[PDB]
């Protein structure tokens, strides 16, 4: 009824419906999986393209906010770019003020605060993208998810996007805390494999790894090797 | 239904008509009639004032913008008071800046621009006062009418207000005579034309008629209750 | 040109000020009071450029009073000092610097007697005894010579009287009468004006 349309209106039952509707957008998004291994965090997502015509090198689902922090998204694509840019900017502001790379937890709190701001005003629409943010700070791997609501949770492993619920179950069954990243990247490709609905190919999937060295996107050749397994 | 398309000035109707502007135009009809006519040397405004009660004084229908320009209001008085102030300030501004009486035509263009902005933007209602503006400038006597819609027209003569068609009819038939008329004749012709608007029982009285005259040698003057007596006495009886 | 002196003690703070307000050379008032009571147990004594003194003092007095009404507990003497300093400091950078020199004296049940000194530039220092004014130069030494951290109230008024008599003997300006008040756990208590006829 009336509660559904407004974003500043709590429904009888105290649910802000437009945010719930916004989360539904993320669910419709392409599957994305994040596993936090002891030595690293692997972020991977499906980049399935409608046609061979699309040039894959042009746009990347997995992006680097800073040398040690990288993010993947499930949801509305235009929105991801806005958040990524604000994130890249928020980090540079930390560097200028404190001259130290931003701790990952700090960026996720800051990006989330931006998301909450969009939620408050009637004029704007909540962002429809959820971000998985992975980083290596203080010799420790970190993985975090920020939902359109503005809430950040820390996940040892999680999957967002289509078939998220099934993905999480597969991961809970296959997750070992002591896993090394080389094993973990394999676990992730398997998790995506569950819902791919097509032959996975190097182009169809995009994967990124965070370690002491810092966030990097595995190039297509490297993934082909991992897929060969 | 078509209840929709009438709520705001910002909604165009399926057939190209902005209804609120039209509804605003209807406001002028609600007001008491006023007649304006021009002669080669003079411009005259005559008005039929209305009174809330016998004890109450008749309202002011003719207001002086400047020595060379004066207006008669038909419609919501509030909109008129606001527009008149804008006009007065625009005239005062010209004298301070250029030391010239503002050309009457230029003022009407400015009233039109101010009036149009409410029509296209959500927010302020369209002004619902209809104004007859009369002035003598170097070009000559001028009579202009302004609709609640910002459109403005230059007229040999015009009557705006309730039952104003009757006045326009008289004015059209006797129009040719007006150009060469003397001032007394011109006001007399006008008083007769507004008489047509009046209900048959009602008659022009010193109390309900206001005459404003501006001319090459006459600064706009509003002859009022006892000073309309010279112009009214010469008039005859109802046809 | 105006003298403020305060002597802290074991259980009391004694504060005194000249009662003269003057124009170029005419001493318009002989009974100006430069002590403003911020709270039952806090007194701010202010000397400085004319106008700025009354204006800053009143603002601080009212703000301190608002705290009392709003929270029900009076501000601690130390807190008030920090508050006045913040305000004066903020203004120093601004185009409207209040040129005021202040001494704040208060008794807090928990922290005992306290005397704070702030200069126009807004430095705050807690001090055992302090004075502001050209007179201070002449009298600070007398206090330094005869002050014991354990001074008794009777001894303190005596020390203050000695300090003031020097101003009569050597200071060029004529400050004839002084107002003296003591803050103790009981609260601000007025003491007789020490007047050198």
């Amino acid at each position: 009824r009336g509660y559904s349309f407004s974003l500043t209106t709590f429904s009888p039952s105290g649910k802000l419906v437009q945010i719930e509707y916004a989360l539904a957008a993320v669910a419709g998004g392409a599957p994305s999986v994040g596993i936090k291994a002891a030595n690293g965090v692997v972020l991977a997502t499906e980049k399935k393209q409608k046609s061979i015509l699309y040039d894959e090198r042009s746009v990347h689902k997995v992006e680097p906010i800073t040398k040690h922090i990288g993010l993947v998204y499930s949801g509305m694509g235009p929105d991801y770019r806005v958040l990524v840019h604000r994130a890249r900017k928020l980090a540079q502001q930390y560097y200028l003020v404190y001259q130290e790379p931003i701790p990952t937890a700090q960026l996720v709190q800051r990006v989330a605060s931006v998301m909450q701001e969009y939620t408050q005003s009637g004029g704007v629409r909540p962002f429809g993208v959820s971000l998985l943010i992975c980083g290596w700070n203080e010799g420790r791997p970190y993985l975090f998810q920020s939902d359109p609501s503005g809430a950040y949770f820390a996940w040892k492993a999680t999957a967002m996007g289509k078939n998220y619920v099934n993905g999480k179950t597969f991961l809970e069954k296959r997750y070992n805390e002591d896993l090394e990243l080389e094993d973990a990247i394999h676990t992730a490709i398997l998790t995506l494999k569950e819902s791919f609905e097509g032959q996975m190919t190097e182009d169809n999937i995009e994967v990124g790894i965070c370690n002491e060295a810092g966030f990097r996107r595995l190039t297509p050749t490297e993934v082909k090797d991992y897929l060969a397994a | 239904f078509r209840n929709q398309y009438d709520n705001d000035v910002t909604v165009w109707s399926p057939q190209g008509r902005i209804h609120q502007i039209e509804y605003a135009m209807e406001a002028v009809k609600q007001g008491s009639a006023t007649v304006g006519l021009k002669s080669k040397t003079h411009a005259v405004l005559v008005a039929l004032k209305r009174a809330q009660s016998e004890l109450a004084a008749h309202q002011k229908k003719i207001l002086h913008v400047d020595n060379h320009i004066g207006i008669s209001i038909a419609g919501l008085t509030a909109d008129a008071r606001l527009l008149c102030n804008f006009m007065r300030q625009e005239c005062l501004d010209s004298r301070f800046v250029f030391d010239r009486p503002l050309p009457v035509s230029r003022l009407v263009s400015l009233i039109g621009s101010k009036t149009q902005i409410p029509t296209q933007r959500y927010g302020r209602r369209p002004y619902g006062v209809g104004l007859l503006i009369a002035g003598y400038d170097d070009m000559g006597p001028h009579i202009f009418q302004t609709c609640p819609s910002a459109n403005y027209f230059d007229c040999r003569a015009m009557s705006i207000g309730a039952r104003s068609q009757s006045a326009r009819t008289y004015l059209e038939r006797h129009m040719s005579e007006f150009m060469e008329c003397n001032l007394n004749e011109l006001v007399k012709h006008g008083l007769r034309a507004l008489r047509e608007t009046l209900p048959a029982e009602q008659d022009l009285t010193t109390k309900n008629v206001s005459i404003g005259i501006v001319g090459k040698d006459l600064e706009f003057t509003i002859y009022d209750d006892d000073d309309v007596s010279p112009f009214l006495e010469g008039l005859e009886e109802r046809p | 040109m105006e003298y403020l002196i305060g002597i802290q003690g074991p259980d009391y703070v004694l504060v005194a000020s000249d009662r003269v307000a003057a124009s170029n050379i005419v001493q318009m008032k002989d009974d100006h009071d430069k002590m403003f009571k911020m709270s039952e147990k806090i007194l701010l004594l202010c000397v400085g450029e004319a106008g700025d003194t009354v204006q800053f003092a009143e603002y601080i007095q009212k703000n301190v009073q608002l705290y009392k009404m709003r929270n029900g507990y009076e501000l601690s003497p130390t807190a008030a000092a920090n508050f006045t300093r913040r305000n004066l400091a903020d203004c120093l950078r601004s185009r409207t610097p209040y040129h005021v020199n202040l001494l704040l004296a208060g008794y807090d049940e928990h922290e005992g007697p306290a005397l704070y000194y702030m200069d126009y530039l807004a430095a705050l220092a807690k001090a055992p005894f302090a004075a502001h004014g050209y007179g201070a130069f002449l009298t600070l030494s007398i206090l330094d010579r005869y002050y014991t951290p354990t001074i008794s109230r009777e001894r303190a008024v005596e020390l203050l009287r000695k300090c003031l008599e020097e101003l009569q003997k050597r200071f060029i300006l004529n400050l004839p009468t002084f107002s003296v008040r003591i803050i103790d756990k009981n609260g601000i208590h007025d003491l007789d004006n020490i007047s050198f006829p």
Binding site: G2, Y3, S6, L7, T8, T9, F10, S11, P12, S13, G14, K15, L16, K36, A105, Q109, A112, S113, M115, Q116, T119, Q120, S121, G122, Y142, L143, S149, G150, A151, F153, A154, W155, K156, A157, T158, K168, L171, E172, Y175 | - | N71, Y73, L75, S76, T78, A79, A80, N82, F83, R86, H110
Partner: protein, 249 residues
């Protein structure tokens, strides 16, 4: 018809429904409990999140340290909470800069509550949907526990629970709490007992609860989140104590 939208329309009968609707949200949230004891004040919360793949990176999910002398627990929309906690931390730091003394506990609560009232009065913003318990020691009133509501109305409670099954907890607390006799040790026990009844899980996981205690030691307040081993001992002690009463029965 509908006098319940916009937060600025009083209903015939004078009720602001949007605030009431907001209060409903706190009910869905995980239970948080605070008990005031002569020695210290404690906040214990139920970490509703129990998904196996979640990491305890933070000091606490629901207990936040507003200032050296005070702490808060939040129940309600998490995003709204993050905004309020940031504000509370700034409000406190501003008092310290201005008066160079720690913010009195009631004042921090009164100020946040004022931000919460404003959101209700002005038209565009939704009323904040969070209810939070503040625990702190102030020189003026010693140890104090305060509960806040989306309305902006705050109260001082010796013990209270906000969130799911709050009513059951208050009833249990009403009989169990002994005024003037509580000690942190006894209170931590009361907390485990009430939490056990309110939470659906038969056994408190000891990973499903977070308990934080504020005590003044050596003249400086210490807010410590009890580590899991400490809580596990408390759960075992309760399990045994209740079992012994059942064994007697």
């Amino acid at each position: 018809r509908r006098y319940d939208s916009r937060t600025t329309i009083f209903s015939p009968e004078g009720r602001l429904y949007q605030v009431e609707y907001a209060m409903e949200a706190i009910g869905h949230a995980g239970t948080c409990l605070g008990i005031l004891a002569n020695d210290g004040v404690l906040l214990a919360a139920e970490r509703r999140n129990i998904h196996k793949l979640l990491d305890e990176v933070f000091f606490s999910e629901k207990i936040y340290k507003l200032n050296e002398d005070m702490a808060c627990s939040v129940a309600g929309i998490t995003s709204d909470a993050n905004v309020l906690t940031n504000e509370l931390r700034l409000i406190a730091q501003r008092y310290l800069l201005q008066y160079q003394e720690p913010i009195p506990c009631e004042q921090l609560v009164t100020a946040l509550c004022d931000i919460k009232q404003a959101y209700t009065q002005f038209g565009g913003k939704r009323p904040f949907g969070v209810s939070l318990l503040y625990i702190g020691w102030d020189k003026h009133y010693g140890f104090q526990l305060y509960q806040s509501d989306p309305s902006g109305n705050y109260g001082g409670w010796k013990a209270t629970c906000i969130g799911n099954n709050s009513a059951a907890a208050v009833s249990m607390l009403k009989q169990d709490y002994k005024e003037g006799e509580m000690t942190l040790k006894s209170a931590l026990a009361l907390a485990i007992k009430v939490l056990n009844k309110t939470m659906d899980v038969s056994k408190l996981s000891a990973e499903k609860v977070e308990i934080a205690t504020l005590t003044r030691e050596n003249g400086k307040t210490v807010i410590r989140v009890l580590k899991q081993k400490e809580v596990e001992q408390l759960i075992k002690k309760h399990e045994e104590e209740e079992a012994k009463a059942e064994r007697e029965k």
